[PDB]
């Protein structure tokens, strides 16, 4: 997945809007919350 | 009243990938809960209605913002002051035009193959989660081949994009509008202007 | 024979020497073990054995009692579920997967917990982050305090 | 001190008429509430007098020059990051923290203070089995002088933040030699395994360059029939686990990184980057010749390169080792001139250059030495200057 | 934090790609732990203070804390008059005027906390872009097997900068040093007795003198030269772990390569759409020759 | 003549000679050619004294920038009156860019010049900022900023703050720039020795309109002597930094050619040897 | 009329309409939980005339003022400094023990001035003898000694 | 539908999303972390003046035998240096040639 | 309650669909609350 | 982005100040390309344009301006490609390589129009492959392979007896529209001159250089007198190893 480039877009989809991204207005900033690396040891490992 | 703009902006704010799949006309509040989304696909049957004045009352839902844009203003001037007083309707061709949205898919029943496709995808890794989201905004909803700029659905065609910015661009007053409108009433068919 | 070993980043020679050490020592009040977990990027169990490991070494070598009961403070909720564990299945030891409860609840079962945590307000921070935040009634009070009989 | 809370502690100040003979002027402000001074400032709670003493008396000993038992020890010994025993800041290490401390440390093991110790085994406590919940932990700071009292921060202009922004802005852009590794460049993985000594990845490349620059009097020469698989990976059916291994290494270690001509990674899903060897086509019809260069060499012809040095270089002109280190390095090398190298060529080939430039048309780039740029690159110059 | 970990990664990623070397796992969240403690910090301080907002002039008063716990709360009588649901929105809009003095205390708390760590990160970037052996290229050039290409694109207008100078032995310890001794020259100066002795000299003395700080004070005890880490002349992490062993070193290959892939890809979509707002980029790609063409 | 030698000459052999100076010096130079800020200042300060088209003053800014022009010490005597005559009649301009140190009243010491200087008038001429003052590597820009940051704010008058002294050509001369060889040309204003500032002041027009700002009187007693000189000198420093640039430039290179022409004769010579042999 | 426009245009205040001012994030957060903060915190204070203003001017039941202010000595990065060396950067620096480094140096420099000026004329060469490269430090045997 | 005994690692999330609140939700006010390399910047120098750069700061010769680093590898090398490579290269194949 | 939001959910998507045809798919206040909440849950599904 | 900004407009790192209706102007221009885009993205034929290997955002050094060789390059040689693809798509040729179809069209009276379009075309692409944009060095090789005919007992006399016979038999040319192609018709070394719509392939020979004699070539920089000074530039920006490379294959 890292290895194919497309799909990377999401984690910085935030810059769609410069002007809301510079204001910081909504903490949604993340793919899966409310940053991008919010959690990658814990979260990932609840599917079975 | 704060029903509608908590629904707004929870959409708006919503964590995980949401997408709006907007196939019909929207008010100001379904356009505001759609427009805002952090993912916004748009069909052939989208329509942005903002249509305040006529009912006597402003224009609500928070769409004035983006008309507001200095992205808008830059591309079309007076085109915020057109939707807001004639109450016209933005298209998804507009709405692409303007950058609004960057997801325009012509697939029918894509909610099935969204289902599907996340039914096949097995993994919950952010990396893999974002890979599978890409790819499918790629090969669906981003418009890279099978798409002419004739065939999308717009309204702000580059003459009436040009009468728009003659007839309301800074133009800082509803009577000197009406003045200006007056005034372009009384061309000639033979005039070059008209 | 014994060459490669997993998790090269985080090695023992570099864990040998407490993160901030001073710093929490002057002060364990305001030292949580999430502050000090923020230095790893391990699982939460790796992390916290980690921050046990190092408290351990830090009372070592400046010669003081160690604090038996931090590893019980950092599993608070561990501690608890194992006692539970071994009051209702007649076994006593630490619970595995094989003897577990086998349930099936929702995606989106943890909503009513995930709204109460967001919005959650707090005066202070150490209120926020209290180590006894675990423990609601006597139940739960005996069921941590139970191990020693000075409490 | 630069701190709230770092006040003095009270000192005597004579009487009314030693106060009116010493001040001048005295101005009296707001009345605020009398602040105890912090323990590093109060005097009979931060007295050294012990420690003084023993550096005191440590100190002439520290007049001589430092020697080593093992006669011949010249490589130094590290001290580890963050050990017990290496850390010197004191934030507040005050005498009654070091008092504490010293108690503790007695009680815990008094027989670490002896010159000849006993035998140390554990006895009964009398704090019950859990002694340790009031016996545990360092001697704890108070929380005013831990919270209230620190150094006032300097305050960071925009200014300086600009600068980093910058900074981190031009370290943000791209190094040409990693989207497409060059063979050359490929070379330069080795392993302290035992398995990857004997067979040579690279010594065909190694070989190349061997013969390419270096003189045969002097340079390697490695032949692969003598190694293990003949110098050539071996079929898929018949490498017994080796030559899969070795195959995966290469290719992790080769594959390239960044964002290519295109803006993309070079093993993206959809589109990908030398097709069919396009980009070595493209580079095989191009190539790497200098018109500075090419009339450089064709003027000189065959002649002493040496010479001509020193007949360029008159006495007391121009040195004549940095001349040839720059003609070197842009000849051999691909780099550009420098300044002292674009004036020589600039008063030694003004014929050749009013050749090429004579009919040129207006609009048509053109072959200038100039200088009047502070850089050497050929980009800031639109490769016009060479 | 976010933005925090978008300039380390970022950060990893150029050193990694510039100069070849890499950074250790734990002193790549080391830094974000740092910031974190210090955020965490200034949320101790700030939850000792106290904001106040104000609604329906003086009717309705909040009493919280920056962080928004609702303290107290004081409401004139005659607000009691109205209905339940007028009362609670104009509690609820109180409440909101006390976040927002939160909020802009705590933002301007959080870009000096920006500020800092701007700061503490400096000498990484300056000693993997101040060393001798430091180029990039610009963007729109195009890259082949042997080298790059350069592309006109108003080559006269195009400008390549230089951030070292080529005279000897130039670096921010000099610069220290200099200033150091610049002012010991102030204070042994006729003038710096007088100014010493003005309460300039000191709150300079207080402030800016951490070799008279008493042992035992917080605080460093002399001021020392800033750091000196050139990328291409320091070993971090890649011999010790190619001593050690080969697969580590190749995981943390992969993974410096994969953020400065990352960090392009970003730059790159926000260059993109920069163009889309000033207007000179489509919506939908209409040069298909500058992609499908290699 | 070798020994009589312009700064073109000067740049052509030292770029021969020894790249890394020249190299330096051009880069600076081609950084203040695309700076803005000096050539506003420039040309707001040349403008009220000189008297002339814009034409010719953006000329004679280039001229300067590139190191054939140094004004005449009376142009810039007349330059900097007719700037503080400027400047107290219409502030707004000139408090836009140009900076005065405003004093505080609340400030206050036991000693008269103290308390003159703390009456909130003018005290001593502000400096441009390093973002957009004269060129500085980024290397060392950071740490730079932080030291003048913090020698203004502890008002520390040592380091980047002094304004090194700037020199002008003598009234007598006629050559419009530095030599090497020719040093009485070049006349430093030194609070001993002043060249006629204070003389040239009082029989100014504006004699009496500069003496009725209620602000620059402290720096006219010269409490020290020196006032006038030194902020005459901070004035011209933060126009035309370039004229002491090339006067350091210049003497460096007179103070090292000669090593250089050593070193390079015994190269020449040892490879020579080594040739013929 | 434009009075219309002017007073649309106008903030707005409970005075005039009666409805209070919208805050979309907070409404979002906090509404469902008012009533749960307030019982937290122990009740609305009712005190008289808490908004009402004197006709003299003065407000009486003074309103209460916030005491917030942004910190100015934090520094977290001054407060965790290097061990040993009192830098506050955030980098691992593995330090040497200062009496190896000042034997180190010494010796490198003995070395070095016996390499390239071996007679002691001050002056580099490129080329130095066989005896001069491998010749044992005498300092180290007179160390010894 | 989420096993019962694996709903223990969503526990740091929640732990997180718990503790995001007041200061730790804050983001820098102007800054968004993507900064676009505008300008091109190099620090190539000739051999010449690498040779002689670091003479003060670091020590004498600091580019001696660097093959990368070096435009000429063995610029700036003594005898000793130079032998032992070239040595060591001839008497690799001392009886074939 | 009112049958005016419905939901689909697969293993990983959930799609949450409008249904009021009678008003023009207008929303009441409760039916807002309503759609508010159902999002807010669905986005802050584990499995979402 | 790349794919999203048009083929005529550049990106700018830098940062620059824009009028409003400039800016509307920019995106208007825009829009119109995308939408020119779409059109002419339907009527693409069999036959494309090659790609450039040199950028020629500048003119080519020391031969040709930016403006002069944007015309030749995408009028000149863009209604060739259309000629041909127009004029193929209907005819059996269709479907088959560049080469079969110059050679199954030469010397077909009826099939001139397809034919002096393909022949156009190949000319127009070896002249684009054979022209560096600072020139190369004639390699060894080549020069001592010319020596043998064209050199007359003088050192680098071969090189300068070319570029005179090349200049002697493009002069040679008065019509000021075809080619001079130095070939190797499988004996030696020999200049030809082909006019407009004749082809070294067609011919069964084997090229090394391309020169483009047209008068459309040198209108703008040389004018019409020009033409030797031409000649001279091409020869200073040509480009060797190519035909070193096409000789040394056709030796073996």
Same mark, same amino acid.
């Given at each position: 997945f ?47 | ?18 997408m ?90 894509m ?9 096949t ?45 003659d ?28 | ?24 020592s ?9 502050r ?24 070592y ?5 160690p ?85 | ?99 504490r401390?010293?108690?503790? *440390?007695?009680?815990?093991?008094? *027989? ?101 620059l270096?003189?045969?009097?002097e ?17 898929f ?41 396009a ?42 080792? *940095? ?25 030694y ?18 072959? *200038? ?18 | 934090?976010?933005?925090?970990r ?5 950060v990893?990623g ?27 910090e ?17 009717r ?13 709360v ?91 100078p ?47 700080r ?6 460093? !005890?002399?001021?020392?030269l800033?750091?000196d ?5 320091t ?8 001593? !050690? ?7 943390? !290959? ?9 960090? !392009? ?15 000179r ?9 500058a992609?499908?063409?290699? | ?53 814009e ?16 004004? #005449? ?30 004093d ?72 419009? #720039? ?53 902020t ?7 126009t ?38 | ?53 004197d ?31 009192? %830098?506050?950067?955030?980098?691992? %620096? ?14 490198? %420099? ?19 003898? %066989?005896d ?14 | ?39 091109v ?57 | ?48 | ?27 208007r221009?825009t ?31 020391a ?26 798509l ?46 190369t ?11 043998l005919?064209?050199?007359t ?45 004749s ?46 490379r ?7």
């Open positions: 890292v290895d194919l480039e497309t799909g990377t877009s999401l984690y910085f989809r935030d810059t769609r809007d410069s002007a809301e991204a510079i204001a910081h207005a909504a903490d949604s900033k993340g793919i899966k919350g409310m940053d991008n690396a919010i959690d990658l040891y814990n979260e990932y490992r609840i599917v079975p | 009243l704060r029903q509608h703009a908590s629904l707004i902006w929870r959409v708006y704010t919503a964590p995980r990938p949401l709006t799949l907007t196939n019909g006309k929207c008010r100001g509040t379904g356009c505001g809960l759609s427009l805002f989304a952090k993912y916004c696909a748009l069909k052939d049957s989208s329509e942005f209605i903002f249509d305040g004045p006529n009912v006597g009352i402003t224009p609500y839902g928070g769409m004035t913002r983006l008309l507001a844009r200095p992205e808008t203003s830059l591309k079309y001037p007076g085109l915020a002051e057109f939707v807001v007083l004639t109450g016209a309707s933005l298209f998804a061709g507009d709405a692409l035009r303007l950058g609004w949205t960057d997801l325009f898919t012509t697939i029918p029943d909610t099935y193959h969204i289902k599907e496709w996340f039914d995808t097995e993994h919950m890794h952010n990396d893999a989660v974002a890979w599978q989201l890409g790819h499918l905004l790629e090969t669906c909803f981003k418009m890279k081949e099978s798409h002419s700029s004739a065939m999308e659905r717009a309204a702000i065609t580059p003459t009436r994009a040009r009468w728009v910015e007839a309301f661009a800074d133009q800082p007053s509803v009577n000197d509008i009406m003045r200006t409108l007056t005034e372009i009433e009384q061309l000639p068919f033979q005039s070059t202007h008209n | 024979r014994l060459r490669y070993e997993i998790n090269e980043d985080y090695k023992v020679r570099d864990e040998l020497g407490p993160e901030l050490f001073a710093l929490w002057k002060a364990p009040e305001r030292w949580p073990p999430e000090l977990s923020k230095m790893y990027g391990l699982d939460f169990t790796l992390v916290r054995k980690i921050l046990v490991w190092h408290h351990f070494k830090a009372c070598d400046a010669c003081v009692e604090d038996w009961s931090l590893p019980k403070r950092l599993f608070a909720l561990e501690w608890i579920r194992d006692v539970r564990a071994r009051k209702h299945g007649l076994f006593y030891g630490k619970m595995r997967f094989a003897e577990q409860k086998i349930t099936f609840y929702s995606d989106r079962f943890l909503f009513r917990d995930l709204v109460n945590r967001r919005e959650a307000s707090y005066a202070n921070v150490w209120e926020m982050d209290d180590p006894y935040r675990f423990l609601q009634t006597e139940q739960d009070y005996e069921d941590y305090w139970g191990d020693n009989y000075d409490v | 001190g630069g701190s709230v809370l770092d006040r003095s502690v009270a000192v005597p100040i004579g009487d009314s008429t030693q106060v009116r003979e010493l001040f001048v002027e005295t101005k009296v402000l707001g009345v605020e509430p009398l602040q105890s001074p912090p323990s590093w400032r109060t005097p009979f709670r931060n007295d050294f007098a012990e420690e003084r003493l023993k550096e005191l008396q440590r100190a002439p000993f520290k007049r001589e020059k430092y020697v080593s038992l093992i006669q011949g020890k010249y490589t130094p010994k590290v001290k580890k990051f963050g050990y017990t025993q290496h850390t010197t800041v004191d934030d507040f290490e005050t005498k009654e923290y070091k008092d401390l010293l108690s503790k *440390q007695f009680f815990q093991n008094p *027989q670490a203070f002896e010159v000849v110790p006993d035998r140390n085994e554990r006895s009964v406590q009398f704090g019950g089995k859990w002694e340790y919940q009031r016996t545990h932990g360092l001697p704890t700071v108070d929380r005013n002088e831990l919270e209230n009292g620190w150094s006032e921060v300097e305050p960071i202009s925009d200014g300086e933040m600009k600068v980093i922004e910058q900074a981190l802005r031009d370290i943000s852009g791209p190094r040409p030699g990693n989207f497409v590794k060059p063979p050359s460049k490929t070379k330069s993985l080795q392993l302290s395994e035992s398995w990857w000594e004997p067979l040579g990845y690279g010594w065909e490349q190694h070989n190349e360059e061997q013969k390419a270096c003189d045969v009097t340079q390697r020469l490695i032949d692969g029939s003598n190694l293990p698989f003949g110098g050539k990976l071996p079929p059916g018949t490498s017994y686990g080796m030559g899969e291994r070795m195959r995966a290494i290469i290719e992790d270690y080769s594959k390239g990184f960044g964002l290519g001509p295109h803006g993309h990674s070079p093993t993206h899903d959809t589109i990908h980057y030398n097709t069919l060897n980009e070595g086509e493209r580079v095989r019809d191009l190539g790497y010749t200098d018109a500075l260069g090419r009339l450089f060499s064709e003027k000189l012809g065959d002649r002493d390169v040496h010479q001509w040095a020193v007949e360029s270089c008159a006495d007391g002109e121009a040195d004549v080792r *940095q001349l040839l280190l720059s003609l070197h390095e842009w000849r051999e090398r691909g780099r550009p001139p420098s300044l002292l190298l674009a004036n020589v060529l600039s008063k080939l003004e014929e050749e250059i009013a050749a090429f430039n004579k009919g040129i048309p207006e609009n048509a780039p053109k072959l *200038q030495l100039e200088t009047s740029d502070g850089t050497l690159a050929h980009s800031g110059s639109g490769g016009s200057r060479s | 934090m976010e933005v925090y978008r300039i380390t990664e970022r990893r150029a050193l990694w790609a510039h100069h070849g070397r890499l950074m250790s796992e734990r002193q790549f969240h080391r830094i974000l732990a740092f910031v974190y403690n210090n955020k965490y200034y949320q101790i301080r700030f939850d000792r203070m106290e904001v106040v907002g104000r609604e329906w002039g003086g309705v008063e909040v009493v919280t804390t920056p962080a928004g716990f609702l303290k107290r004081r409401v004139n009588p005659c607000v009691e008059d109205l209905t339940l649901y007028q009362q609670q929105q104009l509690i609820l809009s109180a409440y909101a005027n006390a976040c927002a003095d939160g909020r802009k205390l705590m933002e301007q708390a959080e870009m000096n906390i920006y500020k800092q760590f701007l700061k503490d990160l400096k000498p990484i970037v300056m000693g993997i872009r101040d060393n001798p052996e430091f180029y990039t290229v610009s963007e729109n050039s195009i890259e082949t097997i042997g080298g790059v290409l350069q592309t006109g694109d108003s080559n006269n207008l195009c400008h390549t900068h230089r951030t070292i080529a005279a000897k032995a130039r670096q921010p310890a000099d610069e220290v040093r200099a200033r150091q001794e610049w002012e010991q020259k102030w204070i042994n100066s006729p003038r710096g007795q007088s100014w010493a002795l003005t309460l300039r000299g000191k709150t300079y003395f207080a402030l800016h003198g951490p070799q008279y008493p042992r035992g004070a917080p605080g460093a !005890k002399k001021e020392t800033p750091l880490i050139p990328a291409p002349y070993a971090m992490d890649e011999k010790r772990l190619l001593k !050690k062993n080969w697969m580590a070193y190749l995981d943390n !290959k992969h993974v410096a390569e994969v953020m400065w892939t990352r960090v !392009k890809i970003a730059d790159r979509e926000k260059r993109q759409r920069l163009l889309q707002e000033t207007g980029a489509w919506h939908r790609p209409i040069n298909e020759e992609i499908n063409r290699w | 003549q070798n020994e009589d030698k312009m700064v073109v000459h000067v740049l052509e052999e030292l770029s021969l000679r020894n790249d890394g100076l020249v190299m330096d010096i051009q880069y600076a130079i081609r950084e203040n050619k695309k700076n803005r800020r000096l050539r506003w200042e420039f040309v707001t300060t040349l403008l009220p004294v000189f008297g002339g088209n034409a010719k003053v953006e000329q004679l800014y280039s001229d300067y920038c590139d190191g054939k022009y140094v004004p #005449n010490i009376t142009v810039a005597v007349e330059a900097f009156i007719a700037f503080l005559h400027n400047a107290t009649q219409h502030p707004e301009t000139y408090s836009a860019s140009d900076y005065f140190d405003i505080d009243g609340k400030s206050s010491t036991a000693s008269g010049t103290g308390d003159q200087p703390s009456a909130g008038q003018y005290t001593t001429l502000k400096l441009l900022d390093p973002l957009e003052g004269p060129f500085v590597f980024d290397n060392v820009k950071v740490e730079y900023i932080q030291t003048v940051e913090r020698f203004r704010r502890h008002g520390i008058r040592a380091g980047p703050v002094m304004a090194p002294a700037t020199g002008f050509i003598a009234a007598n001369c006629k050559s419009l #720039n530095y030599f090497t060889r020719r040093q009485e040309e070049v006349v430093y204003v030194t609070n001993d020795s002043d060249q006629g500032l204070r003389r040239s002041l009082e029989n100014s027009a504006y004699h009496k309109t500069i003496a009725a700002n209620p602000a620059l009187q402290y720096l006219l007693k010269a409490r020290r002597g020196a006032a006038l000189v030194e005459f000198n901070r004035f011209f420093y933060r035309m930094p370039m004229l002491n640039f090339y006067q350091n430039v210049l003497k460096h290179y007179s103070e090292t050619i000669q090593p250089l022409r050593q070193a390079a004769k015994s190269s020449t010579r040892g490879l020579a040897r080594a040739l013929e042999s | 009329d434009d009075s219309d426009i002017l007073r649309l245009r106008a903030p707005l205040t409970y005075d005039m309409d009666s409805t209070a001012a919208l805050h979309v994030p907070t409404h979002c957060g906090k509404a469902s939980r008012l009533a749960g903060m307030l019982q937290d915190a122990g009740g609305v204070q009712v005190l008289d005339g808490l908004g009402e203003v006709d003299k001017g003065e407000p009486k039941v003074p309103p209460l003022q916030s005491n917030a202010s942004v910190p100015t000595n934090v520094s977290f990065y001054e407060m965790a400094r290097h061990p040993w060396e009192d %830098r506050a950067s955030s980098w691992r %620096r593995d330090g040497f023990t200062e009496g190896s480094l000042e034997y180190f140096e010494s010796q490198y %420099r003995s070395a070095e001035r016996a390499v390239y000026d071996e007679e002691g004329r001050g002056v580099r060469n490129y080329w130095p003898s %066989r001069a490269v491998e010749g044992i430090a005498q300092e180290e045997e007179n160390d010894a000694q | 539908k989420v096993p019962h005994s694996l709903i223990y690692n969503i526990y740091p999330y929640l732990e997180e999303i718990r503790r995001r609140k007041g200061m730790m939700a804050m983001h820098p006010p102007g800054k968004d972390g993507l900064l676009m390399p505008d300008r910047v190099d620090n190539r120098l000739p051999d010449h003046l690498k040779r002689g750069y670091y003479d003060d700061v670091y020590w004498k010769d600091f580019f001696a035998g660097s093959d990368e680093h070096l435009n000429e590898p063995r610029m700036g090398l003594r005898g000793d240096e130079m032998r032992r490579r070239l040595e060591e290269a001839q008497t690799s194949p001392a009886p074939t040639t | 309650a009112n049958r005016t939001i419905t939901g689909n959910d697969g293993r990983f998507s959930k799609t949450i669909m409008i249904n009021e045809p009678q008003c023009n798919q207008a929303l009441s206040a409760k039916t807002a609350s309503e759609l508010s909440k159902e999002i807010d849950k669905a986005t802050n599904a584990v499995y979402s | 982005y790349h794919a999203y900004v048009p083929k005529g407009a550049s990106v700018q790192m830098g940062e620059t100040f824009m009028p409003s209706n400039i800016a509307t102007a920019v995106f221009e829009e119109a390309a995308a939408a020119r885009a779409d059109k002419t993205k339907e009527e693409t034929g069999f036959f494309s344009q090659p790609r450039l290997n040199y950028p020629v955002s500048s003119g080519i050094p031969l040709f301006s930016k403006d002069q060789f944007d015309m030749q390059y995408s009028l000149f040689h863009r209604d060739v490609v259309e000629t041909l693809n127009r004029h193929t209907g005819t059996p040729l269709e479907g088959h390589n560049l080469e079969t179809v110059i050679r199954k069209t030469s010397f077909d009276a009826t099939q001139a129009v397809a034919h002096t379009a393909a022949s156009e075309h190949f000319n127009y692409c070896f002249f684009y492959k054979s022209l560096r944009p600072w020139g060095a004639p390699p060894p090789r080549l020069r001592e392979a010319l020596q005919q064209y050199g007992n003088g050192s680098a006399d071969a090189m300068d007896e070319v570029r005179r016979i090349v200049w002697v038999t493009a002069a040679s040319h008065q019509e000021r529209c075809g080619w001079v192609y130095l070939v190797w018709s499988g004996v030696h070394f020999d200049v030809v001159e082909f006019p407009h719509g082809c070294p392939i067609a011919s069964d020979l084997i090229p090394l250089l391309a020169l483009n004699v047209h008068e459309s070539a040198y209108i703008l920089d040389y004018g019409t007198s020009g033409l030797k000074q031409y000649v001279e530039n091409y020869f200073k920006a040509c480009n060797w190893p190519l035909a070193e096409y000789y040394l294959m056709a030796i073996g």
